[PDB]
Amino acid sequence: GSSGSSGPNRRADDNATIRVTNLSEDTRETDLQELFRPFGSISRIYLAKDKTTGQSKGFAFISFHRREDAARAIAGVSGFGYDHLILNVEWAKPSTNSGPSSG
């Protein structure tokens, strides 16, 4: 069970953002940069960290440049064998919409 806390107002409606959960203690930003690289060039890599412990909470958020490169990961990372475990990934934003403007 992972607490469901939130603060950083992240209003992503178009930008490429993906969420990650079930990470390891040996999984840092540099470890993810090479994991989501095979898909393309990552723009930013966020990782949940504590202030009292100063460690990796367990989840992270990778930001892609294009909508395709971002999806490429969510598809692969899904069911990956990271640290002998089942990594979890999903679009940071909800699928409320059903096809935005075309162009």
Give the angle 18-24-25 at the CA atoms, nearest 5°.
Answer: 120
DSSP-based three-state secondary structure for 3 = coil
Q: How are beta strands 88-91 and 16-21 bridged, if at all? A: antiparallel
Tokens of 52: 């009292």
Tokens of 29: 């930003």
* Terminal-to-terminal C-alpha distance of the chain: 41
Method: NMR
CA-CA distance, 6 to 10, in Å (whole number)? Answer: 10
The structural domains of the chain, ordered by start, are 1-103 (3.30.70.330)
